[PDB]
Assembly symmetry: D2
């Protein structure tokens, strides 16, 4: 199953090791990443929305790795598998 | 007194660089609307930040970002209120 | 209660009194809009992700109105009320 | 040369639908677009493009020269 997905999550930017982790993972799987929207919602917290593209198993595995990191809050995935 | 588009390229593994870029933007989160990030290759990221506020304050904030060691291709488009 | 939300949906850009309606209603409510990301996922379909901010009841009501337009598909609202 | 590019512009939406359709004609050129509804009438959009710099100046023509598009700017980032 190919498709798209929308992955969103909140984190504190001052948690530097977490943040570096999040961007680096996206670069490692940069093939799966289309682009990410970031809102610095307040002094401490960031809301990010990553648009992903690829095989749905791969997209979900990737999303899991992100959402299952201590410090990531409100992790959410919307899967958009290819339509006929 | 307006909007602005701030764009730049940087290496995300440069830990201090990356830290300062996001930290400066959170210090002025009131001047920030939203940022689009594109991972252009394994090392480099492209960000485009839309800014809003007093043009003096927005320029000074954009300068603070652009002036950081390792920020490349920095560009500011000012859009003062019409 | 106040907060943020992520409203996403898919639409055909050619069926576009629809696209005009979708941008126009966001402008009528631009106080709720932060910014919107668009990805042209294929030649016919557009994925939009609208970040919203405000009262969560107004955000819900706004989002329901967007999603109820015929031709908006995959309408999805993720609410992030203030913690 | 290949690379990326940033195309920004302002327009009155009440146009939005043809600019979108115009980018779909080139959707292989498009990465994603950020849009901010800056006031009741006007939209700010920033399109990130990727591909051949000549297709990119091409894309950026079918938008920037259109009537009603203001504040257009193209930044090309040829691969380093
Ligand atoms: Ni942030
Ligand atoms: Ni990146
Ligand atoms: Ni589109
Ligand atoms: Ni708009």
């Amino acid at each position: 199953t190919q498709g798209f997905a929308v992955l969103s999550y909140v984190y504190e930017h001052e948690k530097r090791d977490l943040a570096s982790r999040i961007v680096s993972t996206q670069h490692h799987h940069h093939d799966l990443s289309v682009a990410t929207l970031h809102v610095h919602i307040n002094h401490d917290d960031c809301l990010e929305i990553a648009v992903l593209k690829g095989d749905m198993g791969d997209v979900q595995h990737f999303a899991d790795d992100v959402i299952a990191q201590r410090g990531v809050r409100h992790g959410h995935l919307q899967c958009l598998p290819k339509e006929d």
